[PDB]
Each structure stands twice: as C-alpha cells, then as structure tokens.
Amino acid sequence: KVFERCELARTLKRLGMDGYRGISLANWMCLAKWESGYNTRATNYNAGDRSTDYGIFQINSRYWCNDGKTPGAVNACHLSCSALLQDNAADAVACAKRVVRDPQGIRAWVAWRNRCQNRDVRQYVQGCGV
C-alpha cells in the first residue's frame, strides 16, 4: 500500500509514535518518506552483505526480522520479515519502536541523518490534524 501523507500521519499518531523515545511524529514521517516513499511493500536487497530492507521503514533483516536467508542474522523484533510487507502498519510500527529502544535511537537509519537531522521537518505533518 502507498499511504498518502496525512493518512499516514494520523495512522502513526494512533499507533503511539508521537514522542516515542523522544522522537517527534514529523521525524518518523521524514524517515518513512525517504526510506520508502510511504510504500509498505518496498523491498531492497543489499548485495554487499546479503541482507534485505523491508517495508515502510526499510527495516533490515540482519538484526530485526527473520527472512531465513540472511547470514548470521538475529530477529530482535521476533517477526517474519513478511509481516513488514503488510498494508496494516501495526507490526512495522512495533518493530520500529524496538529499533529505537537501542542507544542510537532514530540515528540507526542513515537516511534520517542525511535527510532529516537538523532540518525543518514540519512540512511532513503540516495540515494533517495531528
């Protein structure tokens, strides 16, 4: 599913992402925007290390979800990577919450540092009613 901006904003707020571990809703929106373009079925294979990024937040199979073909991988979210490809964002959100519970927080995603950190991210939630 490809979410529309405000639809996603409202969805994420209902799932309790606003202020989760000190991370504002607009930061999560900026992350989803750059990682997948708000697309839940987005997948990206990393030929260099044999891992794959899954879903709206592009969560990596080496540390967070299990896809069975990633070498030396763990499954910290205790989820099949398939769960991160559903239209229903509940599991992807639960797993994204797990990722930021680690010391790096939102910085775990390099795209956030490149395109969101220290920037005016208000535009991602403006006019959505959240």
Side-chain angles (χ1 to χ4, degrees):
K1 166 182 183 178
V2 182
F3 278 86
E4 298 204 58
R5 187 175 60 95
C6 295
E7 178 190 7
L8 185 66
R10 290 191 290 273
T11 295
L12 295 187
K13 189 167 186 301
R14 198 162 47 240
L15 300 176
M17 291 291 254
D18 196 21
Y20 190 79
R21 294 289 290 165
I23 307 159
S24 75
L25 188 58
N27 274 294
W28 288 115
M29 289 292 297
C30 183
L31 178 67
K33 153 74 170 68
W34 293 105
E35 288 299 339
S36 62
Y38 313 138
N39 183 11
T40 63
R41 68 120 62 200
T43 58
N44 220 81
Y45 180 67
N46 302 299
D49 83 320
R50 307 195 155 166
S51 75
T52 302
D53 297 319
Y54 296 92
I56 204 156
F57 296 120
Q58 287 292 274
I59 291 158
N60 195 263
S61 61
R62 183 162 301 280
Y63 318 91
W64 317 102
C65 63
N66 181 43
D67 67 3
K69 57 170 174 57
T70 303
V74 288
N75 178 10
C77 294
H78 305 137
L79 286 172
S80 168
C81 294
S82 182
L84 303 180
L85 300 176
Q86 306 175 78
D87 283 357
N88 186 310
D91 298 326
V93 162
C95 187
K97 283 180 182 178
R98 171 64 188 80
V99 175
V100 304
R101 236 173 271 146
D102 265 26
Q104 284 195 287
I106 188 73
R107 290 166 163 66
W109 286 274
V110 175
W112 183 82
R113 290 133 70 158
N114 301 339
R115 4 269 318 201
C116 309
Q117 187 182 179
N118 299 148
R119 298 188 191 250
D120 186 354
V121 295
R122 290 164 183 81
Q123 56 160 299
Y124 299 102
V125 302
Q126 287 318 272
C128 301
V130 295

